[PDB]
Coordinates of C-alpha atoms and ligand atoms in Angstrom, one line a residue:
Chain A
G2 CA 170.5 105.5 89.9
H3 CA 172.3 103.5 87.2
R4 CA 173.2 99.8 86.7
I5 CA 176.7 100.7 88.0
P6 CA 176.8 101.8 91.6
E7 CA 177.1 105.5 92.3
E8 CA 180.4 105.2 94.1
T9 CA 181.9 103.3 91.2
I10 CA 180.7 105.8 88.7
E11 CA 182.5 108.4 90.8
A12 CA 185.7 106.4 90.9
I13 CA 185.6 106.0 87.1
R14 CA 185.2 109.8 86.5
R15 CA 188.0 110.7 88.9
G16 CA 190.2 108.0 87.3
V17 CA 190.2 109.5 83.8
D18 CA 191.5 112.7 82.3
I19 CA 189.0 114.3 79.8
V20 CA 192.0 115.8 77.8
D21 CA 193.3 112.2 77.2
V22 CA 189.8 111.0 76.4
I23 CA 188.9 113.8 73.9
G24 CA 192.4 113.8 72.4
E25 CA 191.6 110.3 70.8
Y26 CA 189.0 112.1 68.7
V27 CA 190.0 115.8 68.4
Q28 CA 193.4 117.3 67.7
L29 CA 194.0 119.6 70.7
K30 CA 196.6 122.3 71.2
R31 CA 197.5 123.9 74.5
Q32 CA 196.5 127.6 75.0
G33 CA 197.0 128.7 78.5
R34 CA 195.8 126.1 80.9
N35 CA 193.1 124.9 78.5
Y36 CA 193.3 122.9 75.3
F37 CA 191.6 124.0 72.0
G38 CA 190.6 122.7 68.6
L39 CA 187.9 122.1 66.0
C40 CA 184.6 120.9 67.3
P41 CA 183.8 117.4 66.1
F42 CA 180.0 117.8 66.7
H43 CA 179.3 120.9 64.5
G44 CA 180.7 122.2 61.3
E45 CA 182.8 125.4 61.2
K46 CA 186.3 126.1 59.9
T47 CA 187.4 128.2 62.9
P48 CA 188.5 126.4 66.2
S49 CA 185.8 127.0 68.8
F50 CA 186.1 123.9 71.0
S51 CA 187.7 124.1 74.4
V52 CA 188.7 121.6 77.0
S53 CA 189.6 122.4 80.7
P54 CA 191.9 119.9 82.5
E55 CA 191.1 121.8 85.7
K56 CA 187.3 121.5 85.5
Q57 CA 187.5 118.2 83.6
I58 CA 184.8 119.5 81.1
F59 CA 184.7 120.6 77.4
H60 CA 182.7 123.4 75.8
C61 CA 182.0 124.4 72.2
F62 CA 181.5 128.1 71.6
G63 CA 180.1 127.4 68.1
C64 CA 177.3 124.9 68.8
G65 CA 177.0 124.9 72.6
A66 CA 178.0 121.3 73.1
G67 CA 179.7 120.6 76.4
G68 CA 179.9 118.5 79.5
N69 CA 182.2 115.8 81.2
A70 CA 183.9 112.7 79.8
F71 CA 180.7 110.6 79.8
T72 CA 178.8 113.2 77.8
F73 CA 181.6 113.5 75.3
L74 CA 181.9 109.8 74.7
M75 CA 178.2 109.1 74.6
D76 CA 177.8 111.8 71.9
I77 CA 181.0 111.2 69.9
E78 CA 180.2 107.5 69.4
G79 CA 176.4 107.5 69.9
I80 CA 176.8 104.9 72.6
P81 CA 174.8 104.5 75.9
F82 CA 175.9 105.5 79.4
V83 CA 176.9 102.0 80.4
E84 CA 179.1 101.6 77.3
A85 CA 180.8 104.9 77.9
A86 CA 181.3 103.9 81.6
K87 CA 182.9 100.6 80.4
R88 CA 185.4 102.4 78.2
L89 CA 186.2 105.0 80.9
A90 CA 186.5 102.3 83.5
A91 CA 189.3 100.6 81.5
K92 CA 191.2 103.9 81.4
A93 CA 190.6 104.3 85.1
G94 CA 191.5 100.8 86.1
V95 CA 188.1 100.1 87.6
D96 CA 186.6 96.7 87.5
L97 CA 183.0 96.4 86.1
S98 CA 182.8 92.7 85.6
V99 CA 181.1 92.1 89.1
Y100 CA 178.1 94.2 88.0
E101 CA 177.0 92.0 85.1
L102 CA 176.3 94.6 82.5
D103 CA 178.7 94.7 79.5
Chain B
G2 CA 186.3 91.8 90.9
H3 CA 189.3 93.0 92.9
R4 CA 190.8 90.8 95.6
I5 CA 188.2 88.0 95.3
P6 CA 188.8 85.3 92.7
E7 CA 186.4 85.2 89.7
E8 CA 185.2 81.8 90.6
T9 CA 184.4 82.9 94.1
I10 CA 182.5 85.9 92.9
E11 CA 180.4 83.5 90.8
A12 CA 179.8 81.2 93.8
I13 CA 178.5 84.3 95.7
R14 CA 176.1 85.4 93.0
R15 CA 174.8 81.7 92.7
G16 CA 174.5 81.5 96.4
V17 CA 172.1 84.5 96.8
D18 CA 168.8 85.3 95.3
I19 CA 168.3 89.1 94.6
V20 CA 164.6 88.8 95.5
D21 CA 165.7 87.6 98.9
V22 CA 168.4 90.3 99.2
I23 CA 166.0 93.2 98.1
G24 CA 163.2 91.8 100.2
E25 CA 165.2 92.8 103.4
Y26 CA 164.8 96.5 102.3
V27 CA 161.7 96.5 100.1
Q28 CA 158.2 95.0 100.5
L29 CA 157.8 93.0 97.3
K30 CA 154.8 91.4 95.8
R31 CA 154.8 88.9 92.9
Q32 CA 153.0 89.9 89.7
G33 CA 153.4 87.0 87.3
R34 CA 157.1 86.4 86.8
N35 CA 158.4 89.5 88.5
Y36 CA 158.3 91.2 92.0
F37 CA 157.1 94.8 92.4
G38 CA 157.1 97.4 95.1
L39 CA 157.8 101.0 96.1
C40 CA 161.3 102.3 95.1
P41 CA 163.5 102.9 98.3
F42 CA 166.0 105.1 96.2
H43 CA 163.6 107.8 94.9
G44 CA 160.4 109.4 96.3
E45 CA 157.1 108.4 94.6
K46 CA 153.7 107.3 96.0
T47 CA 153.2 104.7 93.3
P48 CA 155.1 101.5 92.8
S49 CA 157.8 101.6 90.1
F50 CA 160.4 99.1 91.2
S51 CA 160.7 95.6 89.8
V52 CA 162.8 92.5 90.5
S53 CA 163.3 89.6 88.1
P54 CA 163.9 86.2 89.7
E55 CA 165.0 84.7 86.3
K56 CA 167.5 87.4 85.4
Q57 CA 168.6 88.3 88.9
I58 CA 168.4 92.0 88.4
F59 CA 166.2 94.9 89.5
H60 CA 165.0 98.1 87.9
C61 CA 163.1 101.3 88.8
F62 CA 161.6 103.2 85.9
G63 CA 160.9 106.3 88.2
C64 CA 164.7 106.9 88.8
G65 CA 166.7 104.5 86.7
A66 CA 168.3 102.6 89.6
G67 CA 169.0 98.9 88.7
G68 CA 171.4 96.1 88.2
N69 CA 172.4 93.1 90.2
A70 CA 172.7 92.3 93.9
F71 CA 176.0 94.0 94.2
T72 CA 174.8 97.3 92.7
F73 CA 171.7 97.1 94.9
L74 CA 173.6 96.6 98.2
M75 CA 176.3 99.1 97.5
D76 CA 173.7 101.9 96.6
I77 CA 171.2 101.0 99.3
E78 CA 173.7 101.1 102.1
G79 CA 176.4 103.4 100.6
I80 CA 179.1 100.6 101.2
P81 CA 182.1 99.8 99.0
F82 CA 182.2 96.5 96.9
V83 CA 184.3 94.6 99.5
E84 CA 181.7 95.1 102.2
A85 CA 178.8 94.3 99.8
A86 CA 180.7 91.1 98.8
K87 CA 181.2 90.1 102.5
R88 CA 177.5 90.5 103.1
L89 CA 176.4 88.5 100.1
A90 CA 179.1 85.9 100.8
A91 CA 177.7 85.4 104.3
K92 CA 174.3 84.6 102.7
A93 CA 175.8 82.5 100.0
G94 CA 177.8 80.3 102.4
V95 CA 181.1 81.4 100.9
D96 CA 184.1 81.9 103.2
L97 CA 186.2 84.9 102.2
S98 CA 188.6 85.0 105.2
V99 CA 191.3 83.2 103.2
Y100 CA 191.4 86.0 100.6
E101 CA 192.5 88.7 103.2
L102 CA 190.2 91.6 102.2
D103 CA 188.4 94.4 104.1
Ligands
ZN1 ZN1 180.6 122.6 68.3
ZN2 ZN1 163.4 104.7 92.0

């Protein structure tokens, strides 16, 4: 479980687009149905980072990093799950004030 | 937060005690300033669930569930926030019929 109800965590995830989220940190270019760019987690000159709008997940073929929007924001900023859930909740339009976290 | 005014949500939270709310689902026993019992969210033989009267929150270290009375009710019964708020408002003495929810 978490300090945010399961159902609400679900609504947050469904309310955001991982491409929009990652695009605030990584310059992405469309290639087919996915978006690609340089991995911000590992160092290498060649693009190896991929994001899938359809699966709502990212993957890096150079370091193995990957996952959904929570995993990307907890690792890009070094912030805990409830802090990443707060920032995704604002993009999703989900209220989190009633759960007395912050 | 939704459809219930912020001041009304604070009257609900003041009007309920999470020890009393969780004690309707979990057998609790006081140990100094907290209440402890078996987790109803995850399966374990030993007690790992705690409730703080002062902070009005709960926590289970064997599964991570936790938070306030809203989180507890929504996750224990699998109900949305409006239903959880109507149940806690009935215990708090707060009338919500004038806000036109459901
Ligand atoms: Zn990488
Ligand atoms: Zn548990």
